[PDB]
Design a protein around this ligand. Sequence first.
Ligand code: G6P
Ligand code: MG
Length: 448
Amino acid sequence: MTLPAFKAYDIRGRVPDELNEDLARRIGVALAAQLDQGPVVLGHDVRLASPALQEALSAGLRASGRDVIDIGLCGTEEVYFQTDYLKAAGGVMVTASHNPMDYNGMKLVREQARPISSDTGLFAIRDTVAADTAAPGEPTASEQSRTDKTAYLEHLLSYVDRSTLKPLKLVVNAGNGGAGLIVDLLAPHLPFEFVRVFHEPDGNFPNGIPNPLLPENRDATAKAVKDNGADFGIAWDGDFDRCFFFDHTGRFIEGYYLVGLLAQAILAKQPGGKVVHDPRLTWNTVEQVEEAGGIPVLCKSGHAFIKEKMRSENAVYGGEMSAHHYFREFAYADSGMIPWLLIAELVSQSGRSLADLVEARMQKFPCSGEINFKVADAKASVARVMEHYASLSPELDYTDGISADFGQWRFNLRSSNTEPLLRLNVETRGDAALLETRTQEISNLLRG
Ligand SMILES: O=P(O)(O)OC[C@H]1O[C@H](O)[C@H](O)[C@@H](O)[C@@H]1O
Ligand SMILES: [Mg+2]
């Protein structure tokens, strides 16, 4: 067979049977043969096994003659940023993002932090690793420790006009992942008062694995916002490339609406720019981008597609409803830090609450939220849905699964590229009743 840890976008598996130090070392060797000339940036998250997996990666890379730049404990976006900033040949982040504490993994990038995915080198690396029975060589290159975050922090701060910021009270919830370390390094440069929840890095995850989508984890941020009268709250996943917002009432804001909000915030600074968006939920983003003078660009979901579309279009910003936000000036990479800095600036400058910034958009384009289905026959289930609606003659688009536009409502229905699931998103033109009846109708057809 094949090694199960090699997924479409990254490496992730259980330690030590799906991923271990030996595999990690062999991955470093294979990665060296895939990259153009230069050093390789390595970083890791708070998980207990991550240092040892990074060390093994470094040993394989240096046995293959690659200099290693160890940036230490960090977020995934710091590996992206330093890989580009230091003009490295590539980078690896050791992380399992949101998986249990017995899982780990790797996200791999080449020059300018361009993704290495299944069809762009990752399965090539897998096959190499699978057949590699060579003895480990010894290092022929050095490792340098470069933990300085100054350039990264200054880059984050460059997205906001410091003099326009107000001393907002912000709940921050690192979920015992790594985000709190960056918050604390930014704080001396910001006027905000921070309310720190689950702040200390702890790979034992005593308060739950870092997944702000779990309602029990969500409620910790919501409660801290309400109990402290905070202007809003921010939570992150463990490697903090995903950020999650809570308004002053404690309400979790559906990530869809952050894409349009951030696009308007960016286009205020970068007039007329292109904005890349996914096909899952679209109408609000298209309208807000256009009303801010930008040009919306439909793109297949998935960071590798989004980033390459942004590059080919010189797009200033891209966003997915799945809490990923990409910035051209950030090496076209996603950041879980830039979004809340931009939102805090927008709240400061506009005098409006986060709630009111999104309220009218949520009323105008209500959405189902993403609903996942594990069914016995995904292909037959999709066919049942499409057959049922055929007589209404929807406008159909196959950018990413099936998108069907009926006029006053639309849906996207696609297979996930990270799990064996179907994912449904529905939205309507200001009609909550139609949203619920169509969502339930599609759901029944899928389960039939
Ligand atoms: O909906 P999926 O195919 O499962 O992908 C969900 C997400 O997986 C990863 O997080 C990718 O980096 C994202 O770009 C993608 O949106
Ligand atoms: Mg993550």
